[PDB]
From a paper:
The novel enterotoxin of C. perfringens W5052 consists of two unlinked components: CPILE-a, which acts as an enzymatic ADP-ribosyltransferase (ART), and CPILE-b, a membrane binding and pore forming component. The structure of CPILE-a can be divided into two domains, N-terminal (amino acids 3–211) and C-terminal (amino acids 212–419). We conducted detailed analysis of actin ADP-ribosylation by each CPILE-a and Ia against both α- and β/γ-actin. These characterizations show that newly found CPILE-a is a unique ART which has different structural and substrate recognition features from Ia.
The CPILE-a crystal belongs to space group I222 and consists of one molecule in an asymmetric unit. The corresponding region in Ia (Y60-E65) forms an α-helix (loop I). Moreover, two protruding loops in CPILE-a were not seen in Ia: G262-S269 and E402-K408, which are considered to be crucial regions for the binding of actin. Thus, these two loops were named PT-I (G262-S269) and PT-II (E402-K408).
Residue numbers in the entry: 3 to 419
Write the structure that this text describes.
Amino acid sequence: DDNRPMDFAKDKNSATLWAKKRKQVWLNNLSKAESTSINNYIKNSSEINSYSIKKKFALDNYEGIETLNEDLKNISTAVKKSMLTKPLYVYYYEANDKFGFNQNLESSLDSNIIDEEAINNFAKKISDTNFIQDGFKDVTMTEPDINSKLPILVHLKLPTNTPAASYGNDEENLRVLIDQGYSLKATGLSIVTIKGKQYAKVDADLIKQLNFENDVISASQWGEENYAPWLKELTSNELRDINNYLGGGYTAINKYLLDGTIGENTSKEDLEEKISNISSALKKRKIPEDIITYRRMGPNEFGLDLNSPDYDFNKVENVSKFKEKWLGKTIPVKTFISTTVLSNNISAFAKRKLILRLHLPNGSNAAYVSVAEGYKNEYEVLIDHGYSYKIDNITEYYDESSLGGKTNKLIIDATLI
């Protein structure tokens, strides 16, 4: 029950009373599998969250580890039994990395003090961005009196209905477990002093973006519902040249857009005609709400060869190089952008190491082209040529599967602009 403030602030006694009361009931409402899985999270959260990432980006017929699948499912159903009846502010310390920001926030002259230039740049970086939150998240009810090393204090507002369960082995320092599927949107920034030391306080809202990840059924229903009319209403030439692009025409078309190259069993005129028809098609029904889309990018899309030493992300140095190079950069895109609404890996591009996770905003000129017959299983959203995207974050994970290439891969969170 929620007969409490929205923000316990520094009032640990109240927060504890509320939490104890909630948690006891919640625990009595759990299955033994659910119970087991929450205790698993207590023991093993890091492994479970890492695993959720490996799993969502894996190929279709990836089996994984059974007990961890159970933990994903059971933790989620468990916490859904503890939904908030009103908003709750929660707290956690955080590092630069989680905001895709690689400038030191600490002043070079005084360790207790935030650097002014850095915090201003930070202010820019955290704006105009929905930070996807992978895995589950556990947070504190109160401003934590721990002498944190970390530069950032997140003050996160959980909305009404958020599954957020009171849990932990210490009844006097119960934590809050937040269900996966959410993103973080900054609502304010300030410097605060805690025990003589400054922190960048990021006020943010927890929000939920459309993001099907592995939910093929939902993704298909959404694509059909929003773009079937689009398909039926195409002009004959638009339908023809979209069909051509999809059927393998994309290579020549996108190459022409990239660097004007014309293999001349075609003409500049024909290439221009197909591009103009596909583009006009893509302007016909703007993306109706923000949606996360995905692309397995080849190394060339970032100036790399398959055999470039820098492409070797199994060395930490190269991941660092890549992060320093591309973090926060704006990438102009002359080509059409083929994406999918699924996080699933794709056989034909199974070993590609760069995974674009692109925030595709409402009003973008793009279409779910997989409504077209014979393409239902591609789950593809095609974006118009000429856009750009900014890189919000670069996050590595190890794809241990052989078909995936036994390699670290980089989840590149980006926003279309």
